[model samples]
Target: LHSEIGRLNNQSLLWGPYRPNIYFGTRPRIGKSLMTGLMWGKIESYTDFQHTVRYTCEQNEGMKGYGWDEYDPRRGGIQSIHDIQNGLDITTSFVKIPGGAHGGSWAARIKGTLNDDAPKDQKTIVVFYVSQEGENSELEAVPSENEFGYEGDVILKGRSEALGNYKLVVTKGKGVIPQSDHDLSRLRGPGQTVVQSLTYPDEVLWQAKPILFQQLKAGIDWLVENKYDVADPPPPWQVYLLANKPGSGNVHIVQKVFEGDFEFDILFSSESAGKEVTSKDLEREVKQATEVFGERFARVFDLKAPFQGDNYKKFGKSMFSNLIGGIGYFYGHSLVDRSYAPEYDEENEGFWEDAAEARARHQEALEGPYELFTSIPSRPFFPRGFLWDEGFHLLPIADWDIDLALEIIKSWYNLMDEDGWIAREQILGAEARSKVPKEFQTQYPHYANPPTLFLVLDNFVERLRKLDETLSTASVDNPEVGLEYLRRLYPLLRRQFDWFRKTQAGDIKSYDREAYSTKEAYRWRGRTVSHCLTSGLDDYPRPQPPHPGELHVDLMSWVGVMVKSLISIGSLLGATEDVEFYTKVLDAIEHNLDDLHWSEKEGCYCDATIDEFEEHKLVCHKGYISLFPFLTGLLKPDSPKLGKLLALIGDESELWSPYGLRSLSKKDEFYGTAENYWRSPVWININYLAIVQLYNIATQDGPYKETARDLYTRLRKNIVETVYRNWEETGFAWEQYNPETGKGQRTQHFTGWTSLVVKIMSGHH
Candidate 1:
């Protein structure tokens, strides 16, 4: 831990926990921050702000706090520390956190002012901090032996050999003035009244900085010069900071509030304590960051701006906007150690006792939730990131912000184990575990999530192609940009691809000699009752007695698409040999898809299970599994496979649904029966992919282009309308939809990648 000094009532705290504080503060000197505080948040007036008409969206009726409709300034209440391995070498470590956690500081500028509602007589600063124990941790600051003035201007100073000295100067912002109402911070004890006033003066300066900065420069200038208030903070101009982490033991959670307009600053230097740091420098940094963010945000909306028709584009823009709103809802940091007991064996489905014993051993060997960083799927439901969800999350983000997307991708890759396995679910730290069940906590190396990461990489390379139109007629500057991206990502992706190709590959030695081609024929592995979860399709029935010889069509198709993406990249990189190899790889897989999985009788691609020393039989199902060949872009645009897929897609008694494509065919005996979770539901993520691939096929200018475009347009309108209407009536985009009624079902506010609908609206990002 690093050393930190903050101002006491009259004297500066000499030493304490090295932590980041936003607005709330402890008394003079303390170890941990205080837990009990007033409830500070955007105060909602529930009178006319009624719930949406359909499913009651009144989550916070009379309550005055945050919800899906709002954004928080504290941003997840977590600190991002870039650990530097060196002894503070500026030249050596500029942007990156060196490595191996040596000694370096992760610092950010804090700017805010006491709002009008802050209790003037309390003579204390309401603050926020990230504690080691996660959201539940707390600390108390009380009377301590001290000198100097009490509650005077605060000077927080700290030093390191690499950087001589740096101090944070905490003071009131320009607009802050004594309020006519009572100061909320004055109440010494916890009370409902005190808690309600937490939103008065906003804390967590950095949170509101973007909006305020945009407003100050643009709004003020707009009003004076352009004669308009084009950019305005929300009606009440509200922002919030977390006053207390959500945890047990405390009956009340705390949030620090700010009112009106105010600002603060932090200064870095090589000088001693109490040195003057020009306000210009602070404003310059502020200006730089906010301006950069503003530009980046503008670029995102611009991509979707050009193509706007009736309500499709309008609806897409709104969903995309809301989707971006959820971005901050999922940024979390923790330390995760998934090490389990050595007794576990993923290879066999076995005796309950040994499996239980393995689990028990794993729990005993379990270690950290340390230094883990992830973008979660849902903050209210799943607060931690799932490996598969991450790939989907980044696909949209990659189009919006390339740098941030790349950073997150690399961060996830860095978490990969030596054997190249990344857990399906990345639940880190004890705090994270609080949300996950004990039964599913330990991760297995053999288990796999969808190789969605390659989808993200595919999107990345495609974007770069637009800049420089040499290969694949792609465009991008300096071809080096795309080359460098490929070089860095190629090896990591290759490792993961190799792992999937090797570990998930099926053996056909048990099958007839003339039936299967090679011992290494692509097939999914490590699936049991869960039913091919590795395929990202939770439970669309598969072969029973999970054999090592069972071959999956979707599994093979996923690999085919990945190989195709790599081939495209290879083309761009001028790696002719690599291109040739992947070309053959795709050709062999395509041939096998035709030879092993396709059924002439069923007219569908199906999964096959080979009995112990027995012949393989097809597990014919007509749902999402059957469409893998179409969705993965393995078939040519002119191929009659399109006709076969469309026949199934248009059939009323099978895969087709009035709302959207169903996960399972209605004619299947198990369709929407037993476990209906993934059976008949319509997921926007899957529907979006169908639209995307269909659009890709339509653009090929082949014989099927007309039919593909017609289907694409129809499905695109249907999907967007369904999601948009539900969002309008319910105020949320759900986890899935009822194929029968098109109503949103399951988790509400699921922006995860249901937001992918935004990307496919115009049939392209």
Candidate 2:
């Protein structure tokens, strides 16, 4: 156990800018650990100074764009911020040195590039702070003095059980305190001060911006009481240096005043790592890491012509980097309802009305503040993890770093409950909860996401098989690590699959629906008139009023894919019984895809529901749901359904667009309705699935092979160009694209599944 703990300590993810919500923050993966952040503001204008400080990413900041230019989770990367309102461009380059008793050492080089419109004599107050949470950590500041007073080379020595002993050296940057009588006077005499050491309660330690303002306010009050002339007062934060407060607590801050183009470095050297890292060393490491990242990206992606240019490579790097850079380590209790009440089952007419009443009673309780190391959908908006979003995030990630992808997978699986429920959205702790609306905070155990992780799992198994084949041909030694991992993962997946079947089982027998299989059909719970959020394609039109007798075609397709994954894993593990069981499950699902959900008149697969006469009726939305069978790879290349599916995908008046396949058909009554979320926009995750299936069919021996290939070529090009063009224009990848205009819309910096464009660009499934 001790060795296992030690081994984990030395891993790459042990320390990083885990606080994705903040502009630039770093902390170890441990729940209670030391953390650091950078805050800066333009002090040139006293009136607008207070509002210019940037610590968190805000929608109203009018930032042109901000994201990692190049990044790898195992190494580090450079983050560029375009603060258009502030007339500043900031670059933060971070690099790591692996191997240590703790989490190794790292350094960050932060530089500011002034825009042409920047103030002629610009003055900026840059504050770098280190704060500790929990009782076991300690940080002491050692400041160096100059003629201007203590203002350079502040070294911080820190120690904790988790980190052992570490030293943080902040290189003194060029610049002087803005010339003002009050500022010069305060820095003179015995009152001259620079570094500040303070402490805050656990609840307030992370609120650095507010605390700094509070301290500034106190300084202003002091100057007022002293009867100092009000004209040309020093920057409020200068009080830290003016007062020279000397004491230690949970936080230590070093403030530097800079003018013109400025650059500084912060080196965090772990004593246990036995190497003293310097700014020079960090610079070399940054260059090497940047070069290595580009080479690796090219090798993994192998982009063909049209995209094989410097500009496209840069765009690809930014998209992929932000996706991985958005990886966060979240820890906090979640609000969950385990009431298991009768109304929660939603098996009766007007079940949504009853479900609302039950929810209103507030039967939810706070469960353990579980730890989840996962990637986020969007940093500015959805900074927390989403179950299905993560599955899509890992597809391209697996191609780059298999180990990192596997570790993230294990972290997500660790969140599963005994009953096999993983919250679809992780709104953990007060910090995470604060970002979310109260109504959306609580999670229900009965709810189910698309189980897209099974798609990633299937990909992993296929890669492993390919690896095995390569070794067999070369007569190389076998490495069973992949098999060992699957062995451990099998039981957990089995439990989740079992829970899914039991919890989301549709009422096929009572509805009297004609189907090849009753037990295999499934429904997405938590459905309403206009939405089935559990489907992950929220606001996509579903059956009106939602019925207990309804069977969702997408859910059935997802389960089909899930069972297919299990069969692959079971066969690899020699679990004959499990393999046979899942094989039969897959067969039943395929048969019912036609018998139950297929709409003969509509010529597509759809949700099945009961009419007023208690007879089976097909509810066709004519969008993503209609293409589920083909999207999930259930249709054979030669199947008769393939032609119709291909036609629907290629039809310009329906699903196909210059951007990609729209979520809903143009002719569908519900297209672009209510919130228009998954109604008409082109979402890349589903498009990626369509592209993969198209590629698979195009490569196989079939009558529609040429047609599939044509669609594949056109759709891939359209999707890639859509993402690339939007990224170039906005400097950010969007949550979705407008089907009509091919413009990015919705969430900005949504490098989540949108990053799948990297895989699409690679032209490899």
Candidate 3:
């Protein structure tokens, strides 16, 4: 999309195809970015390195290439992406031709890289196929063209004998190409050998990257001799599930009923000139594969795996460390002493946020991970929360299991940067969670996201303390399991608070921002980059910006949530200063609201500056994010302003929609009621958060208890019906639902949100 060639080269390419070269699709409110932390307690969950415990702990920057894991320095990426301590060289990119008529030609790549500083030893850039089904983390990369379709010696841009000159050898492949096919613009031709050499030259050569090359001969020979086929199937079971449900790909569990024995293999029936699988061919392949598997292998099966089943419980009871190593396995929890952070005022910053600016973090990249998974029908992009909804996702999960909720709480607290702030955005570089190890992914300096973590932490801890489970609350210098948890958490939360207070504009108004430091917030060409626009409506659109409005609720909710959490953290730890500070913050939130947070007549929140309205009056579009304060008690439902706000949101012509709630009111010029992938549609996390808030307030105020109960019951019914009906019809918890009929709209694959329903329905009995 950019005109600069430098950016273009840097932006293009990866492991394989799931997304297009351009940023497209509605976002699911939640994603691996957050789920990795919540479920596995770290960002490496579900990544290839996670499978091999050693990778997450000491690979240096090798974690970046978790999907594609390819390192083509000539392409411009030059850094170490993953960590030797606890990451793998996985790369996520794509080879996709635009679907439908008039879309485009050939395939495209959309990957970002992070191999620049990885350990040279065992330094591999593996391109995993976009696994849309179970255990997607272990899948392999499927090429765009035929297997090794390029027809030339795989050259490393130089003669093989020069100083630092590298040579590529055909490691394996029975009928595959001999070298990385050298067709300049090849779609398909002859196969070629891909080499792994001279990558991150500073590390151990015997480690893996180059060693893999040396071992390729022996390894492939072993495979050949052993009669084990090693071809990576193009259409992995996950990809097939995604292909089946492009827009609404469910993330909680992939539904590949008859797929245990089937595989998704991308084929080239015709020459590369016009290679594509027709709908009929696709149907035939699916039908034939289903029959080949077994009589029970229907394309769709009622063989159920709900979101909250024995599944999604990753990391049983582990003391998660940054290196991806853990004290335990699976997901077990009950420890909730974590609260607060250590260094919030931007002091003592190190690693990600404080690293040298010029040294890149990633070098080469492979595709097939994020690239291939992005465009699944059920897994929309922006319409969903991506990483933002993680805290929201845990609300119901916590409701079902207090200990698990506590585990999630301590985990988030442990991840705060020196400033006591989590990145709160996608990683920036090719392989980092954020650009650096701890940088927020806002990219923009003055932007920040919602502070919802405070509340999530507080609630989880409160429930845990009530449950009488062992937790830590010792001085950070001295330690007890639970007390120590609080000690570690308090400093971070305090620092985060300090950062907010320091950045405050009018006392209550604080500045927050993020950068997709190491995460692919958006896909372009065959590369991934930290692009923030994909986060959703933002501080742009000329005279009027949306980011301020969106960011406010996130900020305010965090503030409120933080105070609430602090109340408990302080009480349990018996830390007077923590308690006092939290109390002050609580008062400050209310005081700010009473003083300047709201406009008496405007009814709802408006941006600080720049006018989007014709009359220049404040505008509240009724989006859940905008209305987040109301649900959190920062703006009580009983207040006079609350009435107006609710009325504004309740208006049928505006935010009210049958599917759930619209992102923007229909009355706005940007609103589009019909199946708009992003501009409209309802999200379940928002619904859950709002409903919880309603219940929270009502519980405290007996008068409105009935109202709160009504809303909760209604929300539960709507969600159940929506999920059940969708499963009955399409067989999955879809990405977004129709505003009018609760029917799912455009999505890539059955996505992660279904877990919301699964967790909710888990304790139904």
Candidate 4:
């Protein structure tokens, strides 16, 4: 036994040889639940770093292992592993579920392993998800349905005929086995599966009832019952208007100053500077933006609409009136009753549109007018930030009103603090601003917000310059009141950079410096840019996590923007040294961006390396991060690599979203839509970047402003119409709206980002 245990530990089989080819499901949530522990099959050999404690996991280099489960009470088993290759002192023991409101399973690391291929002179071995009474959990546990009376008859089955051997039943209300004499049977409680092995490991699997829906319901209830509501009946309307706190030097305050008003009195056109826009004209434009498409784009009151709920007959017309409030007519220089206000929805289904019927409604939302802020509680509003909203909204507005699109840029900046910290998002009510400091609290704070901000800003300045050589003051107007907004950002960005480095969660990075110098080390680089909290509005990675593939792209894009912003800021400051630094950094991104970031043979860009890459590497990641090269000007359309991305967009099983572009490509690791969250839809911000980047590339080649203008008009038109229709139909602007179902998700009504949408529609001051 000593020799065998030593051999297995030496080989590192009990923990992992965590490789893609060897593993079937890449994650715990894949096909079914997977549990690995002391008494189970081999823990294949992973790197030396995989042997560290959880707290030390971040520092371990070249560490590789699957995500383990944390203890939960959910029926679905957590993905955990046996620590047979135990380097640290360890012992095996039976365990059971801990108490709490626990339901979902989590990732955990086991600390025991087998001696050898054989167990105590036993022939083929068997592993069981032991539900022992004492010693609850040396490993994290989960909630069993048995506790909830679900074990009466329903049974969860394990696959792999040889490896699958267990059953669950309800005897007492608590659930127990009828025949509990045997050690294995006694160890296994009701609803808990026990497997005895004579069989070798052909396949190991568990089919416990999934707990996602239950968790989702719980989450939704928690969000509704606990969050959103403010103790105050509601302060004065001017409270919302108090954006910059009395005289903040930021000129972007123009939009916030008009909060709650529907018509925008400010309109900037290439034809005129200081253009006086009456609320009256703004209202007319808004109505035009909405009504132009007529029945194709139906209003809440449009009885003859393409899509209507079965139970919405008597109360249908009144659904929106409950949520919206504003001036309704065109004023001398501004608009009134901007019907685009966000009102609450008493029903679970607030503002909703199906996939097929949404194109028209989306078209209307994308039409004229620029940015528009959403009312309080936006979701189930319309999806915020997705391409459908961005492109469609901006497409039309750019033609007749470029200023509105530009206002979003100002709105984003308006939220920025002197030190360059903006909360991960600006949606939701002022209450959100209460607990969390807007500074550096991002969706993935370590990652950048959509790079679309810079692209939009760039477009805004570029167009303003084009409209007239003299209207170029906006370009030179950084640090408006002499505050170094961008200056304060880099250190913060560097903090994010550090976070990315520390939490690069187990992707590989290879290097080569052979001539006279040798260097080799492992990295924790990830593939996407989603941070722990900020950017997600309300739903961030609580227990942070993202696929390395997506993280790769998100981080790269973020770096691209950070570098670009720094370069621009350096230029504005006339700090040649800073400029050189940023330019060099940006240039470095051009060279390193997603290099070797994919596995062609495997068909996805899951990792990046500094060495030669395989030919025909995998390319099907639904992540918007890797799409950066083309979207952010790091790579040209003419580049061979970008062609691969374009291919994915056209691929039927992936990139293309009926509502817009899907967040996680259908073929990629994570593609989902619940409550119409942006996690699964194309956002306006990214769309705007795509449009502008394409135009930037085109224009740089030549003065094809007309071509740029055409694309711009289409995209802007779509944006305006989408926002208008979404607001009119739904009572508010949602953080995300699904393209397929058109159901909004994570909707925040008070977040200023939504406000940007309204201002964009109206064309901010």
Among all candidates shown, the one with the greatest lDDT? 2
Residue-wise lDDT of candidate 2 within 1-765, one digit each (tens)?
323322552365688888888789888888778888998887644456677888877665468888998887667889998887777899999898875777789999999878898985676678887888778778887645555446557778888888899898888765444544454464443222256789888767777877777776776667777765457555443443334553467887676666677888989999988678987789899998888887888888888767898888888888889998998888878999878878989889999999999888899999986888888998889899899999999888877766667777888899999999999999877778878998889999999998888888887887788721121112111226677678888999999999899899988788667678768788889998888999998898888768888889998898888888898889989999889889889989989889988777888898888898998888888899899999888887788887888888899999999889999999999888779999999999999999999999889888988998999899989999999998888787889999989999988889789999988888866
Clashing residue pairs in all predictions, respectively, total: 42, 3, 223, 147
Off-target runs (Cα >4 Å) in candidate 4 are 1-551, 598-620, 673-679, 697-725, 743-765
> TM-scores for all candidates?
0.66, 0.95, 0.46, 0.37
Off by over 4 Å in 1: 1-127, 130-318, 321-364, 367-374, 467-478, 513-516, 520-523, 571-580, 611-613
Scored by lDDT, model 2 comes in at: 0.81
lDDT of 4 by residue, 34-123 (tens): 232222222122222222212111112222222212110111112322223322222211111111121111112122322343233211
For model 2, the superposed segments whose C-alpha errors exceed 4 Å read 1-10, 44-47, 143-149, 183-193, 229-242, 467-478
User: How displaced is residue 720 in candidate 3, in Å?
Assistant: 2.6
Report the candidate with higher TM-score, 2 versus 3. 2
Residue-wise lDDT of candidate 3 within 1-765, one digit each (tens)? 112321222122111121211111111111221011000111222234234322222212322221111211111111112333432322222122222222111211122222344332222222211111121221112221334222222211111111112111111212211122223113212222222222222112113222333433453344346443335321111111111111111121111112011111222111222444332444354344224323311121112224233222211100010001101111111111122222211222132233223113322132212211111112212211222444544444344333334444554454444554343442222322211333222232223455555655665464446401111111121224445556666777777766655443221122232211211011100001122232333321111332222223334555676677777777877888779867766766665443333556646653332233322223444455456557666765566665555565556787766556576677666566333444567766566556556556556664555665665555655665575666556433456677777787554223344445543343221
**Top-TM-score structure, candidate number:** 2
Q: At residue 678, what lDDT does model 3 achieve?
A: 47
- lDDT comparing candidate 4 with the true structure: 0.31
* Candidate 1, run of 10 with poorest lDDT: 87-96
Give candidate 3 regions above 4 Å deviation.
1-387, 396-414, 426-447, 467-481, 504-554, 597-602, 610-617, 635-638, 673-678, 697-703, 746-754, 762-765
Note the residue pairs that clash in candidate 2: 193-241, 332-369, 333-369
Per-residue lDDT of candidate 1, residues 393-506 (tens digit): 776666654544664676678667666777787665443555568766666666677777778878777667661011211213335544665666676676777788766777
Task: Report, for every candidate in turn, its global Cα lDDT versus the true structure.
Answer: 0.50, 0.81, 0.34, 0.31
